[PDB]
Amino acid sequence: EWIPETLYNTAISAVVDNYIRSRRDIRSLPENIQFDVYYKLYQQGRLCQLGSEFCELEVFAKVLRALDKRHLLHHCFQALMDHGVKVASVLAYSFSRRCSYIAESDAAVKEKAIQVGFVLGGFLSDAGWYSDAEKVFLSCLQLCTLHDEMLHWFRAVECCVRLLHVRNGNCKYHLGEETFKLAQTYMDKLSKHGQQANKAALYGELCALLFAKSHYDEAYKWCIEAMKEITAGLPVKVVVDVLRQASKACVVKREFKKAEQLIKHAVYLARDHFGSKHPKYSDTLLDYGFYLLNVDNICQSVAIYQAALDIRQSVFGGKNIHVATAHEDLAYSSYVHQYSSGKFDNALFHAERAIGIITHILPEDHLLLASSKRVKALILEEIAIDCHNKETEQRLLQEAHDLHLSSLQLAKKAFGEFNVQTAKHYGNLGRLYQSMRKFKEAEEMHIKAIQIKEQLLGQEDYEVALSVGHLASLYNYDMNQYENAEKLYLRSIAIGKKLFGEGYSGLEYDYRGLIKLYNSIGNYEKVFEYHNVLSNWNRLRDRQYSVTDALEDVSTSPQSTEEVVQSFLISQ
Amino acid sequence: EWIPETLYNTAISAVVDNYIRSRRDIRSLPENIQFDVYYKLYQQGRLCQLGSEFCELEVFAKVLRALDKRHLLHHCFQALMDHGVKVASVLAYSFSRRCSYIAESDAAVKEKAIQVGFVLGGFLSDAGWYSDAEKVFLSCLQLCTLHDEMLHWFRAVECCVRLLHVRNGNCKYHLGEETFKLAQTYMDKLSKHGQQANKAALYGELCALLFAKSHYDEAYKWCIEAMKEITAGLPVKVVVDVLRQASKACVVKREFKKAEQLIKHAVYLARDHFGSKHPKYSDTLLDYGFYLLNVDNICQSVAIYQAALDIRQSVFGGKNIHVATAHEDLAYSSYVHQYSSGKFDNALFHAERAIGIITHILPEDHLLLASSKRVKALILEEIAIDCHNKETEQRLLQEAHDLHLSSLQLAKKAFGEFNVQTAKHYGNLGRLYQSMRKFKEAEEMHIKAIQIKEQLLGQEDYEVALSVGHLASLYNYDMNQYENAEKLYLRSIAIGKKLFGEGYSGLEYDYRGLIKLYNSIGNYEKVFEYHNVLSNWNRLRDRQYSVTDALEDVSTSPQSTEEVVQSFLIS
Amino acid sequence: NKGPAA
Amino acid sequence: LTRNKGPAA
Ligand SMILES: [Zn+2]
Ligand SMILES: [Zn+2]
Incomplete structure (x- = not known):
């Protein structure tokens, strides 16, 4: 033309x-x-x-x-x-x-x-x-x-x-x-x-502050008080911020059905008013990716994060803290999704960019580095075990050790000894020590992690289940404490059934751990039983996990404002 | 111990x-x-x-x-x-x-x-x-x-x-x-x-005889007549025999909703009284898998035939005609399931057994050979295409060419010239002649297959749409008159989404035909559009294709014996 | 695509 | 795959 x-x-x-x-x-x-x-x-x-x-x-x-x-x-x-x-x-x-x-x-x-x-x-x-x-x-x-x-x-x-x-x-x-x-x-x-004055925005910011500080219960209380203060006259930015923060607060409290509709309404409001290429829409997709990455929805969380990153890569791209946050959140999500195959070339690349941007625009002792230096480390050890050169193995293990220690020190200085984030750092150190053949203090790290997780999150919680699963994998595979591994594996599978049902990703890992546990003690009928259970679990994973793109699952014109908030409030 | x-x-x-x-x-x-x-x-x-x-x-x-x-x-x-x-x-x-x-x-x-x-x-x-x-x-x-x-x-x-x-x-x-x-x-x-006297089982037998002779209009008329006279006091074997052969008449009538509520109850009722390893139960699965074969339930259609054959094999010994018919459906089910992959290894073996069992026990001019030899010839056709050696291709196509006409003659003698099965062989020969490089004969066969099958079935039928696709696939490659295939292909997609939706296996070779047709004349404003259609095709069916068999799909049936009968009859 | 239904 | 996945980020 x-x-x-x-x-x-x-x-x-x-x-x-x-x-x-x-x-x-x-x-x-x-x-x-x-x-x-x-x-x-x-x-x-x-x-x-x-x-x-x-x-x-x-x-x-x-x-x-x-x-x-x-x-x-x-x-x-x-x-x-x-x-x-x-x-x-x-x-x-x-x-x-x-x-x-x-x-x-x-x-x-x-x-x-x-x-x-x-x-x-x-x-x-x-x-x-x-x-x-x-x-x-x-x-x-x-x-x-x-x-x-x-x-x-x-x-x-x-x-x-x-x-x-x-x-x-x-x-x-x-x-x-x-x-x-x-x-x-x-x-x-x-x-x-x-x-x-309207209290929704302030209480939502309190929800974000306390969830970042890992005060999950008080974050839930303050998001309740935030959504009790939502009216139609509020700007849509404030409304979607309150819903996304409350959706983050609901997941850590293990109430996913409320968080489902909350994040769906948040994504719908972000798409309807702002658009498909707006930074606030990217923030809502980051929170949606967090929600999906929590409840078993991993094949679509990466697609959500890739959409979330591509908005931030286009609206304001280069070396920026929001692009770095998108890279860091995608890298952990790509780490989880790609964990089964074992390759980590792309995930390490997206973790390194998040490292290479935060270290340029923030001080070297900033908390946002700590939330990123873990992810790269969580990739490096996974690259380290799958490698074959022993010098490369040791060097990447020590690099992951340095990253975890720096992140642990930053988290301990910021929050304190008794917190969920410090417990996650302890669990990462424990699994790394398991990967580093230092099994004597790996048990100490794992028990220190579980005694802090179960004290704050209760005896039945996702992080507690993951930590005790790591401890059981340490016991049954390498420390030869087979008697203690059985109760921990049963606790892990029980919490998985209570929270996520039978579609949890770590159920494969703990079932293989139980297979190796029972093979060592010669109880072959339990080996057969859990082999049948593992086959049933694999079939289940192949059954209710269909291709459903979450950018479309939010639909168009769902339950609008003053309806999702009211249902969530009366659902308490 | x-x-x-x-x-x-x-x-x-x-x-x-x-x-x-x-x-x-x-x-x-x-x-x-x-x-x-x-x-x-x-x-x-x-x-x-x-x-x-x-x-x-x-x-x-x-x-x-x-x-x-x-x-x-x-x-x-x-x-x-x-x-x-x-x-x-x-x-x-x-x-x-x-x-x-x-x-x-x-x-x-x-x-x-x-x-x-x-x-x-x-x-x-x-x-x-x-x-x-x-x-x-x-x-x-x-x-x-x-x-x-x-x-x-x-x-x-x-x-x-x-x-x-x-x-x-x-x-x-x-x-x-x-x-x-x-x-x-x-x-x-x-x-x-x-x-x-109860005219339920006696009218139910015409639901298979007229179905066999492709009298779908007459069979479906007798499908309604047989289903009315059912009674709770009838024997369960009599009842399940009516439902199986009544469901088959609905599948060929291009009705899917009322067929599944009939045949699933037939599976449920047969499994209850008889069991999961009874000959009558396996007879239901073959009729049940016929439904799954035509509704593009291809993934479990092979499994349900595989389950059906194992029931007969565990009860009906070796060289038995019922095993051969069970072998027959599984041989064809793998033929359409392994079409893209080309893994016709067990497909031929089941087909080879199907020839092996029947020839020992039935006469050489029996019509069941014509049904059996047709599928094996279809196996030989796709095998010769996949094979790299051209010397192997020229021999196996002739072997398949031997079986079709021998099968067609038996169909012609027993069914008459104007029948679906005789026209069904015409459609096979047209596709066969495409591989045989007899393009002028392929054109003659395809027009025979489309002026006869469509003549009595109607302008809208599943098998008629496929017969168009065989000739539509012809004009794309050998005849090269893309204007003829432009109208033919447009008919193939048209009937495909009426019942099967966009995600149908035959439509993949139909959407690709339009792009191949458009690629010759340099058209590109539709090629980019239809490339997005394939992306929609590649996902939407695979979005809802996750592994799920049919024995637990039926499970226990909330529907009772009377809850299925009246629902189908009033509608 | 593959072939006619039996 | 000896171990489970990482806790969180
Ligand atoms: Zn300048
Ligand atoms: Zn003898």
């Missing part, structure tokens, strides 16, 4: 090619042309002519006003941040200075600055630069506290709820509790004057 | 080793004792002594009354038929010889002969020797038409329902119509004399 370009696109290419001479008069253009000039500068590769223009806060304020092309602004901004110029830090520092300067001005100028800060902080926290998003939200909060007017109280609540989302993503959990205390103080004195 | 042998079993081996001296007095033993003496002779391998007394009708009369151990008599009876002596033929002749001797005798002695005739004739009908069961039934039918009494016409109708069953399996369809007309003579006479 070869249609000619419009006069708009031809004029853009006639202004960009004369940018350096008319850079002053471009800033006076309409806000919907200024973005097109700057996006053309990005497209031509003239990032330094562009990074010289986005660093000023006033120029970036009008660029942020174009909400239609925010999906292009995220790509442009992410292309600046890995180009070398630190646009995120510069904008935050400039906004902090301007807030500290106009703190003494009237209410209108302060309100305009607070709105500019809300949009800029929403963009920066949306782009993932959390450490450069506190300096904007903290300045907005400081602007809020000066005058005791009512809108100032409500916007201080907004500053606290948005700032709390930044710190949870930045893994500053110790300050999240103080931020929530400040927010609840502001909302208490808001309700003292006779009006109540 | 060394359990001592029962004195019953110990005394059995004590008299078998002294059989010759006590041969006369064993016949004076009780029937439960007598059978175990004979079954031990087979177990010891002394078939000659076993066959030394089954050749007498009186000895075989007592043995036939061991109803619990009938499954062991069938395995011994088939052993004798592979041993040599034609115990089926001599028993039928001996019974027919003694039957005519009591024509002038009293009805007290006469009535015993019909009772002997039905248990012996039913057994040979169960054992498959239809050519000898007919001579038994024709003799007892003669007695029922000598003295005019109300009970005599009550059993004369009982001969003709089973006479019409031993002539359906023996491919004597021409004489089958006469028996039904002869049946109506006594059936109407009994109806006039205050006795409405």
Whole structure:
């Protein structure tokens, strides 16, 4: 066809090619042309002519006003941040200075600055630069506290709820509790004057904070209180955030039927309003992938994560913390899915990219590294055992040891000794020590893991079952403590039947462990019995696990808002 | 743990080793004792002594009354038929010889002969020797038409329902119509004399005879007629025989919903009373697997035939006609299942056995060879295509070409020119001539197969759609007139999704035909679209194809005997 | 594709 | 495949 370009696109290419001479008069253009000039500068590769223009806060304020092309602004901004110029830090520092300067001005100028800060902080926290998003939200909060007017109280609540989302993503959990205390103080004195603000967003951020800190029971309580505060007038972003956080909170509490409809409604709301290529939609797919990766749904969790990564690889791609989180979450999911075959070339690649991005944009002692350095390690040992060279075996085992020890130290410093995450680190160390032929302290690691898991998650829980399964595999295969392995294997299969039924993936591993257990003690009739059970289990895995793409399983126009939340509330 | 042998079993081996001296007095033993003496002779391998007394009708009369151990008599009876002596033929002749001797005798002695005739004739009908069961039934039918009494016409109708069953399996369809007309003579006479005889089993036999002659319109008409007269007081064997042959008429009528509710209950009812290793149960699976073969339940259609054959093999010995028919369905089921893979290893072996069993026991001009030799020829056709050596291809295609026309001639003599089965062979020959490079003859065969099969079945039928695909696959490659195949292929997909959906096995070779047709003329706006159709095809059927057999699919049936009958009848 | 139904 | 899979990430 070869249609000619419009006069708009031809004029853009006639202004960009004369940018350096008319850079002053471009800033006076309409806000919907200024973005097109700057996006053309990005497209031509003239990032330094562009990074010289986005660093000023006033120029970036009008660029942020174009909400239609925010999906292009995220790509442009992410292309600046890995180009070398630190646009995120510069904008935050400039906004902090301007807030500290106009703190003494009237209410209108302060309100305009607070709105500019809300949009800029929403963009920066949306782009993932959390450490450069506190300096904007903290300045907005400081602007809020000066005058005791009512809108100032409500916007201080907004500053606290948005700032709390930044710190949870930045893994500053110790300050999240103080931020929530400040927010609840502001909302208490808001309700003292006779009006109540909406508590859904704040309590959802509490749910995310406590689930990240692995306080599963209190996370469930706070997501209950969050979904008790959901109305139709809420923005769909807040609504879908609350549902996805509550869906994460429901899975760790082993209530999957509620989490099913919760995550289905969250994915539906994210797809209907935002779109199939939106970062919030990518976040909802990450939570959906977490849900599927928990309840036995592994052949589709990778497909969910690949869709989740491909959105973040396109909306804002390169070296970014959200892309790194998608790579890390996919790598563990690909590690689980591809575990049966034994090959790990792709999973290790997706784990290494998550390592190579977080180590570039975050400090080397940051918690998000710990949540990633495990995954690569969990792959390396699996590559290590399947290798054949002994030097390579030992080197990859020691590399996994270093990664697990660093992650364990970070988790122990952040949360503490008695937590689920530290117990998971202990279990990883125990299975690695089993892989490293050091079986004496492998038992100590596994028992330390189980005594912390069962104390917090109860005697019957998925993590407890997995840890005791690892301990039983240690006992029956290598430490020759066959008598103690039987009760642990029975506990593992019992918890698997209670939670996941007979379709659990680890049932194959524990049934093979039981086969080897009974072969050693010569009880051949039990060998025959569990061989028949294993064949039945394989048939079952071949029966109710059909090809059902979860991007389609969410359907279209399901139970809408005020219906899924109500059913979930009355289902308590 | 060394359990001592029962004195019953110990005394059995004590008299078998002294059989010759006590041969006369064993016949004076009780029937439960007598059978175990004979079954031990087979177990010891002394078939000659076993066959030394089954050749007498009186000895075989007592043995036939061991109803619990009938499954062991069938395995011994088939052993004798592979041993040599034609115990089926001599028993039928001996019974027919003694039957005519009591024509002038009293009805007290006469009535015993019909009772002997039905248990012996039913057994040979169960054992498959239809050519000898007919001579038994024709003799007892003669007695029922000598003295005019109300009970005599009550059993004369009982001969003709089973006479019409031993002539359906023996491919004597021409004489089958006469028996039904002869049946109506006594059936109407009994109806006039205050006795409405149950026209359920007798009307149920036409559900297979007319089905065999491809009279689907007439068979489905008699399918409704037979299903109405069912009654809970009927024998379960009679009831299950109606459901099997009524379900078959629904499959060829391109109706799938009412067929499965009939045949699944037939499987459930047969498994309940008889068991999972009974000949009647295996007879249901072959009819049940016929449903799965046509609804594109291809994965378990091979298994259900494999299950069906194992039941008959465990009960029907070696060279038995029922095993060959069970071999026949499994041979064809693997033919369509291994079509893409080409693994026709057990497919030919089952087909080779199907030829092997029938040729020993049936005449060379029997019609069951035509059905049997057709599938083996289809095996030889696909084998020659897959083989790399061209010298092997040119010989095996001719061997398959030998079987089709020999099969077609037998079909032509018994069914007439204008029939599905004769047109069915025309469709096979057209595909065969494509491999035989006789493209002009292939064009003639395909137009014969589509102007005859469509003529009586109608414009919308499963087999007619396949016959279009055979000629559609022709114009794509050899004739190269893609305009002719453009309309032909469009018909193949059209009928395919009416009943089978998009994910049908024959439609894969149909969607690929459109792309191959479009690739020649350079069309690409549909090739990209139809490539997405194959991606939809590759997933959607495989989304719902997960391993699941049919014996646990039926499981226990919430539907009862009456819950299935009325549901099919009103709809 | 494969062949006619028996 | 001696062992089960990793706990979580
Ligand atoms: Zn630069
Ligand atoms: Zn002999």
